[PDB]
Design a protein around this ligand. Structure first.
Ligand SMILES: Nc1ncnc2c1ncn2[C@@H]1O[C@H](COP(=O)(O)OP(=O)(O)OP(=O)(O)O)[C@@H](O)[C@H]1O
Ligand SMILES: Nc1ncnc2c1ncn2[C@@H]1O[C@H](COP(=O)(O)OP(=O)(O)OP(=O)(O)O)[C@@H](O)[C@H]1O
Ligand SMILES: Nc1ncnc2c1ncn2[C@@H]1O[C@H](COP(=O)(O)OP(=O)(O)OP(=O)(O)O)[C@@H](O)[C@H]1O
Ligand SMILES: Nc1ncnc2c1ncn2[C@@H]1O[C@H](COP(=O)(O)OP(=O)(O)OP(=O)(O)O)[C@@H](O)[C@H]1O
Ligand SMILES: Nc1ncnc2c1ncn2[C@@H]1O[C@H](COP(=O)(O)OP(=O)(O)OP(=O)(O)O)[C@@H](O)[C@H]1O
Ligand SMILES: Nc1ncnc2c1ncn2[C@@H]1O[C@H](COP(=O)(O)OP(=O)(O)OP(=O)(O)O)[C@@H](O)[C@H]1O
Ligand SMILES: Nc1ncnc2c1ncn2[C@@H]1O[C@H](COP(=O)(O)OP(=O)(O)OP(=O)(O)O)[C@@H](O)[C@H]1O
Ligand SMILES: Nc1ncnc2c1ncn2[C@@H]1O[C@H](COP(=O)(O)OP(=O)(O)OP(=O)(O)O)[C@@H](O)[C@H]1O
Ligand code: NA
Ligand code: NA
Ligand code: NA
Ligand code: NA
Lengths: 217, 217, 217, 217, 217, 217, 217, 217
């Protein structure tokens, strides 16, 4: 019953479509280029060649049978803009659009895009964070000051316990998860040790985590 | 600090350069497009116009002394491949490369790319997960089975204590954080309550977290 | 006098610029085409080569201080849209935009265009009205029902007085003006006569005016 | 019986065709681009894909069954020129052609075009008139010195009568129409009042109308 | 001598310019192609780079004072037409124009071209006449019926006197000239003989000349 | 039986083909562009779409059933060169080729072209001769020193006889033909007169003809 | 049974395919351009139009029934690179690839190309050797110091024996073959003579051969 | 030394230039591509940017004094042909030309090319011979029947003497050289043995050599 349409098969849009189909959902792959439709037809419940900037073709797809629509056109600003305008004028509930710059974001905001995504920009900032800090594998920001960070275990952390490396007192951070040799310990007891090259999931303020990385690692 | 060289100022590479310079790192912005080098001039230490595939221009850039080199050319496969093979011939320790498809990733593997990144693919996976479940704001996967997940609160959770929603034994998860009205509570107590439209950071197995999303949300 | 800035010197925009400068107004002629800026140089106060979609060039033009800004780019939808959104971000009070189709008009509505113009459409309507009825030279519509209409005289009207063609009671209209042999009579008397190939300015309901065109012409 | 052919479907030509069809006439939409024919087929009694610069195709349309022919090609000077030459050499009674510049007008004049239209230029001068004079909504020029002008009612005109604002004596102009809240009074008696934001249709010399606008408004 | 201006240095126009300068005439070689103006520089009095369709450049060339202006642009119809209409607006007495097809010839007729030339067409007619009859070297048509024709001699004419081949009464023609071994005899006598592979200039009706070509050759 | 093939339908080639067909011959029109074949099919005994630079297509036309072949490709040097090489390697008796420059002539000479034609160049020199000498309508060169010239009769020649204007004694030229009001007198008697605007066909040395034009005209 | 696939029909690849077919082998000609397939279909046991950079098409050809595969694409570096990567990932035993530069060679080496060929470069060095030494017809290098060289017999060598021109003692080289008037003597006895313009196949160190050429020739 | 001029720096021509300069010859590297002239600057005596088809630039290069001129343009047939005809018109003694197909070779034959080379074709023949027989490393053909061939040794030949493999009488060939472990033995004795993975230089009839390859290898 729940229906997703993915217009603009690219890296972002193709990933969205393939992942939504893998999850067992109803997805329609839409693209103006025939080769992209041929490539993503195996990964969609239905795939059509449609110039989504044309109205008639959009109505022929039955764009109104879809609860969610994702305009993944991010390089052609005019195409994405007028596709989103068409979709909003056809009373589509949820419209998520890939953006290209701040001004494309402003245009999509003014025309009524329900969600605007900047994939390359967010990945750029995350990869820069992992770049300057070689210890960070991944993280998630709780706010402008707090976050949960996954770290690669260290020369200094090898064979040390959670009270030997106390963080709730020495840094104000909380030990959260340990990953060793494929196994994963959640909410670990104060007796658990950490070996080198393990995955340490910690949580707290960014500055305290950086201080732990500088002194405790 | 450190020495980063961002070849190919795109959305991804430009975000990398801007974020790295915001954190005060020496970042060399390299591109072939004059307007691209003009766009990130104030957002980098040195912004030079140069063709990265030419060995003479790479020697002119002094690229052999940089510790970190990130090429962000994804659409142009030949340029990215030859630039990566060049930098590897110049014996660069850290080479991070943005890829476009599986075969580009494999050809970067064979020529010695240190870290290959697929930004749009991972972001599409994340946004598709957020699309299938509107409650999920952000998340991070500890493995192929356990994750830390951020949720948006529901009318079904307004003014309900943490002990009322026992997640340690009813589902085997752990509530981690409560963001409310711009403030944030880390590692809360069983007596703290939940209002609607709050940010709930939980941690546990994916299936158990979604079981909560079904039963209690 | 006033401050007008005509971005996009086209046929429409070039006519605007030429006419406004003929009446002695400070008009800034802005275009990307060097030959276009060279064409209207003597027909404007300042004629500058600049890309209107670039924010830096718009700041260089001092466009933030102008009271009236008219962008005449119709064919290029993306350039017109981003220029309009730019000028609105710069808080311009009066933004007049030339449009190309309905969706361009809507996207200009959503980004805050002050007045959207469709020159070719309205002129086509007028010329089609003049085509269906060869008697109509020009006209202006007071509403969707009443108009002031200019006619070319017919052999059926040579040397016939205004009282002979009673239009106030026979059709409910009013004869307004009589152009003859380069001279012009405004608000004529019932004793003035009509010769053929004269300009007859009448006013009234469209259906009644055409009823006259049928019966008396 | 009366037949119109509209060659050159653009903004101007498309408007002409759609308006002529709305009026209940026989129109044939001709265009070299298939998409334009597909778009305007719903708005024409018949629509064909024809390269109107080719003779054979023009004869195949039966261009001789048409009393009126409108060459709305205004960007390609050679195409419009040779289409008009073909049409005049095929003994078409009325040929109306959209022009682009003064020299295209001269060429069409020399080859025998029955009417030459400059839509963008006329709209440019009219919009410039409405630009410098913010009170003018629309107008119609009776001669180089006299015209009928429609104006937006003023702060000063609110709740004032036609003898309180005497124009036949104080300015030499004639009150002609009033439009208030959707209703429209024609040839109004001296007792009618005028409220703010009403539409005031006046008629007279341009200088007297401007003096009224300066002092009386 | 005289003032010629060859606009559009092509094969035809370049030949005109080269031959006219060889005979010592002031010839202005005008073209848009820089290499074309460089090619005929030593073969003209003045060779200037200029766009002929621009009125300002034509005024810069001082083209209004030239007595003879020959535009040789044939492929580009619009450029040739506008250049011709320009030069006619500048009141040039002698305007010679190279045409490409019948409609280009007609549009040059209507805009006032003084002499329209079709070089390739006439040369094709001449070469086709020489192809149908290998005896014909060159010819000139006095009318649609009588011509002066040059023939190549045949074994059937070696050492035969002019009185032996009576052409004044047997066919009604006149033998005019005998070219033999680099020498040439004008208006020969009945006693002069003919050798093979000579140039025989005859004059008369086409049918009678070909009757000779059949019977005596 | 006699067969002509015309490859390269242009102005020159199209004229050759149309004139050869008008003469009642067997012509095959060959062109790579489909529109040219469609245009010249009505003027050829057979017309085909063939890329004449391909061998297989040439053999499929039966290029060997043709005694004469005319490569009228004059703008593409490589196409004409390799078509002529193919034709000579297929043992075609007579190959006549349109040339473009002296070096193309040399190439066609070396590869074995039977005849090389420079139509535009010859017409250029002839039109230049008619340009500098406004009296010359047409002519034919007998040698480097002698020629027959057709002239427009003169103010001075009006109503004068052939002995009154003696040329065999005063100039060494021979009176040859007179054309008056459509009639044409050949080999005229010494009593024939010449009126103004008549056509005077004279024959002799170029210098004597020029002296006659200067003094006798 | 033995199967060769030749992808990339060019001069090199076309020669490989035609020669392999002449030898009586099983060859499949693959090319993205239809005309190349049409040209080489007569010279291959099977020829198909296939975009070899696409996987699906490669599997459809049955690229796995081929023991040898030759990627003769040498101008498009990306196409050849990704075709070779596909072929190696499909477990093709022998992959021989035409290269373009040293860096393309390095890429093909890293991705696992079984053989890399530089045809133009090797022919360039061989033709340069024959250029500076006009006596060398062909040769074969045994090592960096020894080679067998074929030479054109000399003015000095005419009618001289193998002991009269002793090379095993005077130069350290070995006489190997003589070719005279089409006949060829192998391992010749000490009595054989050598005439001028014969072919002399000698073998030894490069320096001794050059000394023989300088003094003995 | 000598004077070589390499026009058209390609893979073949660039290899020629590099090898000839390595051997210390005055080589003029001529190309139209600026980057190509910049690439071989250090690998030539003089590297000049020039269009070879322009006669003026060829005179500027002083090409008329060079003894050897090698044009390596193969893809561009017209440029190569006109350059060759130019250099032949300048009476160059030695003109070597790279060809692309048979007809290009013939047109170079007809215009007087001294030596025409087909590098890719001959290399394809050689590599196809090495493909049909993996034992063949290199070879040189003494005629259409006898060759000197280099083989890779087989397990079937390890530690077998030359007299054990009698090739003079069993097959009529002669073993010439044995390369082993970087050393090389010329004209070996019957007592020398053969190890596997050695280079065996043999000489004789092709059929007899392959008979050995079958029976003894
Ligand atoms: N009407 C349309 N107009 C334009 N593109 C369309 C349309 N319909 C579908 N598409 C497809 O949308 C895709 C948008 O990809 P594009 O290259 O423009 O963006 P991108 O942001 O660079 O891509 P990526 O998602 O890989 O980051 C293209 O594959 C295009 O074929
Ligand atoms: N050889 C090169 N040398 C330097 N810069 C280059 C080179 N090739 C491409 N670039 C630059 O790389 C940038 C990104 O290239 P491209 O458009 O191929 O990437 P993309 O992956 O499609 O973009 P995005 O990063 O926005 O997803 C551009 O600014 C381009 O100018
Ligand atoms: N970004 C820009 N900045 C400045 N000038 C621009 C820009 N984009 C277009 N123009 C100019 O706008 C003018 C008109 O543009 P365009 O051809 O798209 O309009 P049009 O509506 O088709 O024309 P017309 O006004 O004659 O109907 C041109 O002179 C062009 O150079
Ligand atoms: N034979 C033809 N040659 C050229 N255009 C043709 C022909 N037949 C039809 N057309 C159409 O005529 C139209 C002319 O529009 P064009 O863009 O050239 O003019 P314009 O003056 O800029 O348009 P507008 O009327 O919107 O102001 C095009 O849509 C074109 O497809
Ligand atoms: N507007 C222009 N102003 C000046 N020169 C021009 C202009 N347009 C074209 N030319 C020149 O006219 C010459 C001939 O033009 P074109 O190729 O259209 O003629 P053509 O009739 O095909 O040639 P040919 O005379 O060889 O038969 C060229 O040298 C070109 O550069
Ligand atoms: N194989 C072919 N290659 C190229 N042109 C071909 C071929 N076969 C036929 N043609 C035709 O030959 C004609 C040659 O005309 P082109 O414009 O090249 O020469 P031109 O000398 O400028 O012409 P013109 O005869 O009018 O002076 C073209 O119409 C082309 O379509
Ligand atoms: N997938 C493909 N991508 C690109 N080219 C392909 C592909 N499949 C076949 N081909 C063919 O491979 C050939 C490669 O020739 P190309 O001109 O690129 O190389 P080259 O090294 O200059 O050639 P040559 O072998 O003559 O030296 C072309 O004819 C092309 O049509
Ligand atoms: N007229 C010219 N004058 C000078 N250089 C030229 C000219 N035309 C082509 N070249 C040069 O010749 C070189 C080779 O040309 P092209 O690409 O046609 O040859 P190719 O045979 O395909 O190449 P390769 O030698 O690698 O097989 C290029 O560097 C090109 O710039
Ligand atoms: Na992207
Ligand atoms: Na317009
Ligand atoms: Na021509
Ligand atoms: Na090559």
């Amino acid at each position: 019953n729940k229906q997703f349409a993915v217009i603009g098969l690219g890296r972002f849009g193709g990933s969205i479509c393939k992942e939504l189909h893998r999850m067992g959902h109803e997805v329609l792959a839409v693209d103006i280029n025939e080769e992209k439709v041929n490539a993503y037809a195996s990964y969609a419940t239905h795939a059509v060649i449609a110039n989504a900037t044309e109205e008639n073709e959009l109505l022929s797809l039955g764009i109104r049978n879809f609860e969610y629509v994702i305009v993944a056109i991010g390089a052609n600003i005019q195409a994405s803009t007028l596709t989103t305008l068409l979709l909003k004028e056809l009373d589509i509930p949820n419209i998520w659009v890939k953006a290209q710059n701040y001004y494309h974001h402003k245009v999509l905001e003014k025309i009524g895009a329900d969600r605007i995504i900047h994939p390359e920009k967010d990945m750029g900032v995350k990869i820069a964070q992992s770049l300057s800090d070689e210890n960070v594998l991944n993280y998630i920001d709780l706010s402008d000051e707090y976050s949960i960070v996954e770290l690669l275990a260290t020369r200094k952390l090898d064979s040390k316990s959670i009270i030997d490396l106390n963080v709730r007192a020495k840094y104000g951070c909380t030990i959260l998860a340990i990953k060793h040799h494929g196994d994963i310990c959640l909410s670990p007891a104060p007796e658990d040790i950490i070996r080198e090259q393990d995955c340490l999931v910690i949580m707290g303020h960014k500055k305290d985590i950086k201080r732990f990385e500088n002194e405790g690692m």
